[PDB]
Amino acid sequence: EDTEADVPVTYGEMVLNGANLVTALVMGKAVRSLDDVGRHLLDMQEE
């Protein structure tokens, strides 16, 4: 026995909100954290 005790956590979560909602019902697709992916792709060509 290391220990009868432990430290569990609570459920994650996600939704289609800002740009994920638009594309889902317009382009028909969606991505985890499109805001992030979008920020990092655009910024990446600004160095």
Binding site: V15, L16, N17, L21, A24, L25
Partner: protein, 49 residues
Amino acid sequence: DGTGISLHRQLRAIQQLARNVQAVLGAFERGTADQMLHVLLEKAPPLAL
């Protein structure tokens, strides 16, 4: 649902319904004229006669 999708589908719902009503209310506008013809044609002799 708490959703952005279910609302949007309900938007399509309200929306398509409004199109149908605009159409059928205009039918009785179209049809009152189309029916007016028939009752004129039904009572109109051919001119030759």
